[model samples]
Target: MRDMTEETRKDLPPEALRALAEAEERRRRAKALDLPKEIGGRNGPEPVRFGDWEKKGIAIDF
Candidate 1:
């Protein structure tokens, strides 16, 4: 696509200009939140389905 900078945005329509600014602002806020990168890996919290879950082996209750 074409380069979209302040200098290049002069020719963009008003709607496109507003959309670009909003997108940038949203991105800035999201990055500033300092949130974790990933979620729910192996051995995570309770499963979504309310049912028994396990492997063929077994587990010892602590």
Candidate 2:
């Protein structure tokens, strides 16, 4: 991945690399904005999944 970054982007022309890099950096910053400071805590909400989801409704299509 590092090598790919160093090399020129095949999909985009040279002129677009600057804009693409700026957009990617902005997205990376946005993702880090709300991250938790601590790795784990007792007060944190428990992880839930499909098994925990209630079957509120069902649809039948034929």
Candidate 3:
């Protein structure tokens, strides 16, 4: 991926800069979900097969 330098960022207006800052903040927050400590601390059973929605036994008729 291309890095944004000061020279490139100089052309961005205030609104664009604000939007980029918000997107970067969201990316940082999402990184916390992948930590090993969080995954190992689960109190219940681990995840099984990918398509186990039926085992949940909650019907949704829409």
Candidate 4:
């Protein structure tokens, strides 16, 4: 479904082809989030510091 060939695509109606193509194009250009800190528990030498704070079950920082 992600990659369609001309031969297989020829049978599809114009509306259907446009819809599927839009989805594939959108997915190809999607962006991902970047995380640079740890909150659950320190995996390094120290817990996250400097304005960083967490309580009980919540992990948050500013």
Candidate 5:
């Protein structure tokens, strides 16, 4: 991924700059999801076959 520098921002068109500014503002006011700490099986590189899958009060595979 490429990081935008201050110098690069100066060359961006007004529309592109406005889009970036709007996205930044929206992210600043957005709330995070309350997902469960645990998900399918172990939190490692392996195939998972667990049960009771859920996140943010939503059940999975029901």
Candidate 6:
């Protein structure tokens, strides 16, 4: 994947710059999810999966 540099940002068109700016703003806001994230800090190349359940006040089966 190609990384956008500061000079490249200046070279980008108006629409491209606008999109990047909007994306940057969205990056600042923390997004919410219906399900909890993956447990344990396993950052290896593994197929991760998260369970789907209604977390009603305090988690379970930790």
Worst 10 residues of 2 by lDDT: 53-62
Give each model's whole-structure lDDT.
Answer: 0.61, 0.59, 0.60, 0.57, 0.59, 0.59
TM-score of 1: 0.26
Cα lDDT of model 3 by residue, 1-62, tens digit: 23344455455567988989888878744876655465466578878766734533344332
lDDT of 1 by residue, 1-62 (tens): 23344454446568978889888877755777765657756665775776776633444232
Clashing pairs in 1: none
Off by over 4 Å in 2: 1-13, 28-62
Q: Which stretches of candidate 4 lie over 4 Å from their true place?
A: 1-12, 33-62
lDDT per residue as tens, model 5, 1-62 = 23345455445569978889888886533667555557556556766787783343433222
For candidate 5, report its TM-score: 0.28
Positional deviation of 7 in candidate 3, in angstroms?
A: 27
Off by over 4 Å in 5: 1-12, 34-62
1-62 in candidate 4: lDDT tens per residue? 23344455445568977888887875533655454456666556775666954453533322
Q: Could you tell which candidate, 2 or 5, scores higher by TM-score?
A: 5
For each candidate, give its TM-score against the true structure: 0.26, 0.23, 0.25, 0.26, 0.28, 0.26
> Which residue pairs does candidate 6 place in steric collision?
none
- Candidate 6 global CA lDDT score: 0.59
- Give the clashing residue pairs of candidate 3, or none: none
lDDT of 5 at 62: 23
Cα RMSD for candidates in order? 20.0, 13.6, 15.7, 19.3, 17.8, 19.9
**Candidate 3: misplaced stretches above 4 Å?**
1-13, 28-62
Model 3 alpha-carbon miss at residue 33, Å:
7.3
Using TM-score as the measure, name the better of candidate 1 and candidate 5.
5
